[PDB]
Design a protein around this ligand. Structure first.
Ligand SMILES: *[C@@H]1O[C@H](CO)[C@@H](O[C@@H]2O[C@H](CO)[C@@H](O[C@@H]3O[C@H](CO[C@H]4O[C@H](CO[C@H]5O[C@H](CO)[C@@H](O)[C@H](O)[C@@H]5O[C@H]5O[C@H](CO)[C@@H](O)[C@H](O)[C@@H]5O)[C@@H](O)[C@H](O[C@H]5O[C@H](CO)[C@@H](O)[C@H](O)[C@@H]5O[C@H]5O[C@H](CO)[C@@H](O)[C@H](O)[C@@H]5O)[C@@H]4O)[C@@H](O)[C@H](O[C@H]4O[C@H](CO)[C@@H](O)[C@H](O)[C@@H]4O[C@H]4O[C@H](CO)[C@@H](O)[C@H](O)[C@@H]4O)[C@@H]3O)[C@H](O)[C@H]2NC(C)=O)[C@H](O)[C@H]1NC(C)=O
Ligand SMILES: *[C@@H]1O[C@H](CO)[C@@H](O[C@@H]2O[C@H](CO)[C@@H](O[C@@H]3O[C@H](CO[C@H]4O[C@H](CO[C@H]5O[C@H](CO)[C@@H](O)[C@H](O)[C@@H]5O[C@H]5O[C@H](CO)[C@@H](O)[C@H](O)[C@@H]5O)[C@@H](O)[C@H](O[C@H]5O[C@H](CO)[C@@H](O)[C@H](O)[C@@H]5O[C@H]5O[C@H](CO)[C@@H](O)[C@H](O)[C@@H]5O)[C@@H]4O)[C@@H](O)[C@H](O[C@H]4O[C@H](CO)[C@@H](O)[C@H](O)[C@@H]4O[C@H]4O[C@H](CO)[C@@H](O)[C@H](O)[C@@H]4O)[C@@H]3O)[C@H](O)[C@H]2NC(C)=O)[C@H](O)[C@H]1NC(C)=O
Ligand SMILES: *[C@@H]1O[C@H](CO)[C@@H](O[C@@H]2O[C@H](CO)[C@@H](O[C@@H]3O[C@H](CO[C@H]4O[C@H](CO)[C@@H](O)[C@H](O)[C@@H]4O)[C@@H](O)[C@H](O[C@H]4O[C@H](CO)[C@@H](O)[C@H](O)[C@@H]4O[C@H]4O[C@H](CO)[C@@H](O)[C@H](O)[C@@H]4O[C@H]4O[C@H](CO)[C@@H](O)[C@H](O)[C@@H]4O)[C@@H]3O)[C@H](O)[C@H]2NC(C)=O)[C@H](O)[C@H]1NC(C)=O
Ligand SMILES: *[C@@H]1O[C@H](CO)[C@@H](O[C@@H]2O[C@H](CO)[C@@H](O[C@@H]3O[C@H](CO[C@H]4O[C@H](CO)[C@@H](O)[C@H](O)[C@@H]4O)[C@@H](O)[C@H](O)[C@@H]3O)[C@H](O)[C@H]2NC(C)=O)[C@H](O)[C@H]1NC(C)=O
Ligand code: NAG
Lengths: 833, 832
């Protein structure tokens, strides 16, 4: 069975780089704090006890209000008068750094105005190992370079707007099946522990860890560790990924929180590098906690060094100061659990004073504009035989397919979007927000037609094929809508248990397109989906004249598409993953069966770095639409590739500090005038009897055998060769080569080009090409510009498991520039660097 | 069994009144016609043989193209690129003479541009005897005066636009059940003949006939006779309704056509007053006709006199010329039967040249404007507890009801509208038109809210009550949509066989409203429906703050309603029927079971004139919303009632026009390829008997020709006859009535003043509508409304005299805002 090697001690914060000032302030405040106060910062108060999906108790003596953590990566979850933004995958499809930042800011403004301190997003785990993973859509791209840049920009938008961002899920949560014991039990599977992701050290460095290196460098404040195990050690107590990769190598200064139910131990988790327990209890409303009272005790009994807890506190307060949350603080002005104006303060046991729980603050501003624009700029024109744009002179327009119309239960009518009904603008689970409204394509496209006095209808039952065939016959253009949904594992729609069961269009999609294409010579397909779908039955039909993939657009779906359809927006989006002929062509099967008896199912990443396009290229498979493909209403030419060589750190840490003092056990007993709320998780002890007030069956049992070698070592540590900066050693960010190329709009209309820069690092086991740089450049017809980027040391290196460092191998390297991963007209050898 | 007395001979046209020019031109051209050319004018060429729903072969030698007849009373049926107008019942709900006219015009223009010669509408029969009758929505109101005026106005609109209008169905086709033998069989009932409407002579004159008199006087060119019997004589061979009432008493100068399948004999119908057989065959594509060849033979053999068929041809050409159709003529440029560009010229047998059958002509112009307007001005605000108009600032809007949303099969996804899915904008059967698009209330309301930056959702599954309740608890306003549908007999939706099985809201309507109102203190109900529905379970719920009835609005439905909800238009529509507490309160039950063995069911109109309000009032029942009721965003005042007293006996002999030759002149021309199933006027051979193929040919003929049916000599003019729409004497203005109307609220809007009379006597309704108008007033603005009462308006039909008489009982006049809100009344001075 795969094994996860220990790495201890759990590194302490040091005011690294851009954290200097936040660290100073964190230190100065925590120095004043009692141990129980410190513990409060680290532990949620129990599932549904307060306002937010996660909430700590704060430190009221020092005027630090409870921290409020709210989902999701695309807008505020479980609230009102908020926006619903397009999904992370849509951000990926824009290939636009700027839009990523603008969407992050727009979200941080909304979060901030609801009195939420921490956004539970953006996501880059899952990266997208398997095209059928239930949650790829919440993230960006199976490409680490594309994902890391957009991940970082999203994070920067959120944090510049004053809210702590949470990079999740760390790490290797690449599928929904067997991600949680109880969750698998509900589906009839009996396992004792969660799926284990077993990955070699090179692969994790070059793929899954890379966006997280970007996130750390860009200043992310929090990290959420995952439900799965990695080499059979749980994500939220895995010292290798937490202490070694994240904190020692990447130099991460902020705090680590558990996924909700991913916390599996007090002592082990605290020593393996966790900083914060969510929602705070062991299971939802157990009135018990691996931390709270137990963490206070674990410090009093000498098992967890004071310097760990102080470090937990320092990292939490440093992330809070770093985004200036303190300057914006206000209690959450809504409740996640009810929409009522009034309710009991403590929702779950219905206790506390009866008071205002919802203020109905409208936080949307004019964010519909950015959502509308982003939706349009994320619509990938996969195919176009001079079918698009529409002129509005189309005499009779047939809008065909359930995905064009309304959810008959209302846009929000399925709990956490747990259905695929009507147009697909948001996938399901906790990565969701309530729509303020949803503009359907039916609505937007019919309004456009009527504006020009044309005739138009929507048929939205995908087995009404008789009506489809009849109308398609009479139509100038048939616009056919189809979708494929997915989401978090705790919801099953039509037997799809988070992960998709297949990659075929839902609701009779293929049959619908055929019924249309058999009858209109001008049939245009629009796909809303979480990821790639199988297009082989119909994409090359002589009558299917254009095909678009629009992702998950959020509240303005219909308007975003019309802007593209009718040419107000020239599509410039590019596919952020691969469209293959078959499911088999992608490889990377999901583990859908118990393969280690009733133990944790084993998920071996035996493809190594070879996911999505890397894999297709290794196997010499031809995608229908390759990673990086998108058409435009104009054309672009790339020429004049040129390469220019350019002229381009502590060895030990300090010892672990402590801040403030720890007193007697009697200092930490339940204060006397305090009504203890049912299910509420507190940091206090029932009495000075440590064993009895912990109530832990394993209290004091073989204690020293369970504290790992190194785990209590407060002495100065060596700095990893790959470490000592932010997102790695800073030498990895030296710029070694400048690349330039001329990009020209050779067509009739203004448009955005997406230059793409790939390298081949060389070597017998390396992908042919891997993306390194890109930009999105707006160009008027005939306009020319010179696109200039740089390659860093990291960009040209590979992870050397023996050196534990990134190394530029002696294989010769090449640069390639062009319009997709397969359309690379320019190449240049790189000189030795 | 009820019996229908003979009236013969069938009156011939005489260039009466406004017909003098058209008649002269018709006589000039018919005089040049051979017998077979004349017969061609009278007979359709067979079901689905040509382009239109009904089509004659015309007279090519004389440059007269075949006459194309097409549904529907609310827009072109079976075509493309046309408009879908609101139903007749909406026109009624507007109480607006000018809007009825403008709608007629807009339709005429469309029909004209398709190469349609004759529109099969408007409808004032059914009048509306029963609230659950399946085609009431097609017509206007169960009140004869309201219906007569708006029917006439529609006709004038269509005809000034150059298309022949067809007043239908004449007469008493008051329910769908049993209207046809073959339909009754597909529903499991065995009957030998169709339902017989049995009505006394007074009731027919004062109710059912009256709007047909208005039609005739207004100049209607065509009348379509009905599928039902009247006293056990078929509507298309009823000498009493056709020869006496329509032709002799009302002086109709136009032509009468059969409904499709309503022609039941060759000779009997010709002599009983029929002028045109549609679709031309005995049954659909039977390749036989009661006329065509048969009518040629009937003339040649001496059974039908030449003057009768000549008269058919004159009535038909005169109608054509009166509207100016000759100046606007073109062959039909679409096919009712396929949307393809090319096809065989003769659809049913797929024979003839292979050529272009559709030209995709976009006749819509800017008609969407009249439609959107008519829809707004037909939306009756039944209740408003200060809920409306909305301001646009509502924070969160809940749109609730399948009736707000899209038909998931596409607006036209159900053939002849034969379903009730998504918003109800058109009821079903032949009274329909393909939508060019359909704007749903969901689309218009959400677009409105989005324009003000609010939040808004639509839930359109009427059993998703969980989602409905949750959303209603969060909304600033709940807009709840519910409907009830009906249509023509040959279609059945949810076991509603045209007629409604009940007056209850379809698709869980009551439970939906209750589910909303139990949760939003601001629940606003919108009903789309073909007529009244029961509201008593929820109309007075304290959270039900407003109720509107929007009818069948047509293509702009959602924009029509938004315009009203958001105050762009101030509603002035009025209820054109009664909203009762129970189905029992209307009386007038349909005949739903055989009551005469396997003979024709018998439908005794035993209530007489007491339908809708007339009956509610006679039984002192209190309606929830009375006939004439509608609210406004402003208020009005009615005052200062002032009353002021104001200051041919034989026909020609029947003419013949042109000549009849030997049989051999009418044998099939030799060069001519006979299309299968196509109906021609010609004979196989000079053998009359063999050319006819009638098993009864030449058997007992004189005994089957009623006395006088061949009498061509000058006839007495009836006392109630002699003019157009009856004796001119009955249009003398006898009394002038005036009142002052003031807008006393704060919003510009329309008032609908209504004048009712009480004619007095033990058998008369307490109040009967006689005049109305729709007057536009700004806040504080006043106007004088002046109107007159004719001799007809003050009369009752006297059976003994066979005339309209002003009876000696004293009469009153009432003016107000509804049939129950009548603050102004006075005794009328005796007039004679
Ligand atoms: C001061 O106050 C404190 C607060 O009150 C007191 O704290 C308590 O201390 C106790 C010790 O005195 C703790 O109990 C012991 O906990 C351990 C650890 O359990 C957690 O981690 C397990 C995996 O851990 C490895 O990795 C972690 C880091 O992730 C390390 O910290 C561990 O040292 C260990 O490290 C090795 O492995 C990694 C690679 O993974 C390497 O990198 C290292 O190099 C090391 O090689 C994990 O598996 C546990 O998960 C179990 O528990 C979950 C529920 O919590 C459950 O979800 C899982 O499914 C799983 O359940 C199964 O096991 C549990 C009990 O653990 C059963 O209840 C359950 O029903 C299932 O059967 C957990 O997350 C734990 O290993 C200990 O139990 C082992 O040893 C005891 C006997 O001593 C046996 O009875 C158990 O069967 C078990 O034995 C297994 O392993 C043995 C090897 O040691 C082997 O010999 C056996 O064959 C067997 O398979 C104890 O439970 C207690 O957690 C803690 N409480 C709190 C609140 O923090 C403190 O005592 C006090 N001080 C003083 C002085 O009084
Ligand atoms: C020149 O060429 C011409 C064209 O080719 C030749 O034209 C043909 O002439 C024939 C006569 O020679 C015609 O055949 C006979 O037709 C009659 C009439 O049938 C129709 O009318 C019925 C109602 O009639 C009344 O009303 C009409 C006006 O609407 C008047 O015109 C009538 O005079 C009669 O008027 C009386 O009643 C009204 C009140 O209602 C009063 O106002 C008047 O004052 C009078 O009192 C109608 O009911 C018929 O309906 C049947 O047919 C429909 C199918 O068309 C069907 O849908 C109905 O359901 C119904 O079906 C039943 O009847 C038919 C038989 O007709 C069966 O096939 C069927 O199976 C059903 O049972 C129709 O609309 C018709 O009545 C005659 O039939 C009676 O008489 C013969 C004996 O002569 C019997 O054999 C029959 O059984 C039948 O008997 C009934 O009536 C008898 C007394 O009248 C009674 O004694 C019986 O007990 C029984 O109940 C003939 O069918 C032929 O129509 C016509 N052809 C064409 C194409 O026009 C012409 O001959 C030729 N001239 C010369 C000189 O050569
Ligand atoms: C009552 O109503 C009905 C319904 O409207 C009327 O029925 C219609 O009447 C039309 C006559 O008015 C008749 O029209 C004929 O249509 C035929 C089919 O037309 C199409 O196909 C051709 C050929 O590929 C195309 O040219 C054409 O554009 C159409 O697509 C035509 O073939 C007929 O043309 C003939 O007559 C006209 C004048 O009427 C001539 O101009 C034309 O040149 C043709 O004339 C030839 O045939 C006639 C006698 O049939 C000869 O007298 C003449 O000399 C020509 O003869 C030469 O050619 C023929 C064969 O081509 C050859 O055998 C001979 O030896 C010579 O060489 C004409 O246009 C409609 O079809 C008919 N509709 C239906 C459904 O039946 C009815 O008339 C009305 N009744 C009354 C009393 O008004
Ligand atoms: C760890 O976090 C915990 C949760 O944030 C902290 O617990 C809270 O501590 C506060 C302040 O120390 C306690 O407040 C006391 O609360 C009552 C307020 O009750 C109210 O009811 C009356 C009704 O008439 C009303 O008058 C008040 O305004 C309140 O609305 C006061 O009476 C006291 O003066 C005092 O404020 C909280 O109750 C307590 N919360 C819970 C859920 O138990 C805890 O302090 C933190 N621990 C550390 C070490 O910092
Ligand atoms: C601590 O005391 C509380 C209060 O009586 C009791 O309910 C709880 O179970 C105790 N916790 C432990 C670990 O004994």
């Amino acid at each position: 069975l795969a094994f996860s090697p220990p790495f201890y001690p759990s590194p302490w914060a040091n005011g690294q780089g851009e954290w200097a000032e936040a660290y100073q302030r964190a230190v100065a405040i925590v120095s004043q704090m009692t141990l129980d106060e410190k513990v409060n910062l680290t532990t949620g108060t129990g599932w549904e006890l307060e306002k937010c999906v996660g909430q700590t108790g704060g430190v009221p003596r020092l005027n630090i209000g409870g921290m409020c953590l709210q989902d999701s990566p695309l807008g505020i979850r479980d609230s009102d008068y908020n926006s619903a933004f397009p999904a992370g995958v849509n951000v990926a499809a824009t290939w636009d750094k700027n839009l990523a930042y603008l969407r992050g800011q727009a979200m941080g403004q909304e979060f901030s105005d609801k009195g939420i301190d921490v956004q539970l997003g953006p996501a880059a785990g899952p990266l997208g190992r398997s095209p059928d993973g239930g949650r790829n859509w919440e993230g960006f791209s199976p490409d680490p370079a594309l994902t890391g840049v957009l991940f970082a920009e999203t994070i920067k938008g959120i944090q510049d707007a004053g809210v702590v961002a949470t990079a999740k899920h760390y790490i290797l949560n690449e599928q929904e099946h067997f991600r949680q014991v109880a969750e698998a039990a509900g589906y009839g599977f009996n396992i004792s522990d969660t799926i284990s992701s077993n990955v070699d050290d090179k692969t994790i460095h070059e793929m899954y860890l890379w966006p997280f290196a970007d996130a750390v460098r860009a200043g992310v404040g929090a990290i959420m560790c995952s439900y799965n195990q990695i080499n059979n050690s749980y994500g939220c107590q895995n010292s290798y990924t937490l202490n070694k990769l994240l904190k020692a190598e990447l130099g991460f200064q902020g705090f680590v929180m558990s996924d909700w139910g991913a916390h599996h131990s007090g002592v082990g988790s605290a020593l393996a590098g966790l900083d914060m327990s969510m929602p705070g209890d062991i299971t939802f409303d157990s009135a018990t906690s691996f931390w709270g009272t137990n963490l206070t005790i674990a410090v009093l009994n000498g098992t967890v060094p004071q310097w760990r807890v102080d470090d937990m506190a320092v990292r939490i307060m440093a992330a809070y100061y770093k985004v200036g949350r303190d300057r914006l603080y206000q209690p959450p002005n809504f409740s996640s659990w009810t929409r009522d104006e009034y309710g009991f303060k403590y929702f779950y046991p219905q206790e506390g004073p009866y008071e205002k729980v919802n203020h109905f603050v409208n936080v949307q501003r004019n964010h519909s504009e950015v959502i509308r624009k982003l939706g349009a700029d994320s619509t990938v024109l996969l195919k176009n035989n001079n079918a698009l744009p529409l002129t509005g002179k189309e005499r009779k327009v047939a809008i065909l397919g359930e995905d064009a119309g309304s959810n008959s239960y209302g846009a929000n009518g399925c709990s956490d979007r747990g259905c695929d009904n009507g147009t697909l603008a948001m996938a399901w689970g906790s990565g969701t927000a309530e729509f303020p409204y949803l503009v359907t394509p039916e609505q937007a496209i019919q309004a456009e037609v009527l504006k020009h006095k044309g005739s138009v209808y929507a048929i939205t039952d995908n087995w009404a094929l008789s009506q489809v065939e009849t109308l398609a016959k009479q139509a100038s253009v048939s616009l056919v809508f189809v979708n494929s949904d997915a989401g978090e594992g705790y919801i099953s729609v039509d037997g799809n248990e988070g992960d998709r069961n297949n990659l075929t269009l839902w609701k009779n999609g293929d049959n619908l397109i055929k019924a249309a294409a058999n009858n209109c010579n001008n049939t245009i397909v629009v796909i809303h989906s979480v990821g790639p779908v199988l297009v082989d039955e119909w994409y090359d039909h002589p009558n299917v004249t254009a095909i678009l993939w629009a992702g998950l657009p959020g509240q303005e779906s219909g308007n975003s598409l019309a802007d593209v359809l009718y040419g107000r927006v020239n599509p410039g989006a590019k596919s952020p993953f691969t469209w293959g002929k078959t499911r088999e062509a992608y490889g990377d099967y999901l583990v859908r069966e118990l393969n280690n008896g009733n133990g944790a199912p084993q998920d071996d990443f035996s493809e190594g770095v070879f996911i999505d396009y890397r894999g297709f290229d290794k196997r010499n498979e031809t995608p229908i639409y390759e990673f990086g493909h998108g058409l435009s209403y104009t054309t672009f030419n790339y020429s004049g590739l040129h390469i220019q060589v350019l002229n381009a750190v502590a060895t030990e840490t300090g010892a672990a500090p402590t801040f403030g003092q720890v007193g007697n056990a009697s200092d930490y007993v339940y204060p006397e005038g305090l009504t203890r709320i049912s299910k509420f998780i507190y940091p206090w002890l029932n009495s000075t009897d440590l064993k009895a007030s912990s109530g832990d069956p394993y209290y004091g049992v073989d204690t020293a055998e369970h504290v790992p070698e190194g785990a209590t070592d407060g002495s100065p540590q060596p700095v990893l060769p790959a470490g000592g900066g932010s997102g790695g050693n800073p030498r990895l960010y030296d710029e070694l080569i400048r690349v330039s190329v001329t990009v020209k709009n050779t067509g009739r209309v203004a448009g955005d080009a997406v230059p793409q820069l790939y390298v081949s690092l060389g070597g017998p086991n390396e992908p042919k090409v891997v993306l390194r740089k890109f930009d999105r450049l707006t160009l008027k017809p005939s306009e020319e510009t010179v696109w200039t980027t740089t390659l860093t040391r990291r960009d040209l290196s590979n992870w050397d498991v023996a050196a534990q460092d990134w190394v530029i191998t002696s294989y010769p390297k090449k640069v390639h520039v062009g319009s997709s991963s397969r359309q690379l007209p320019l190449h240049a050898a790189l000189p030795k660097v």
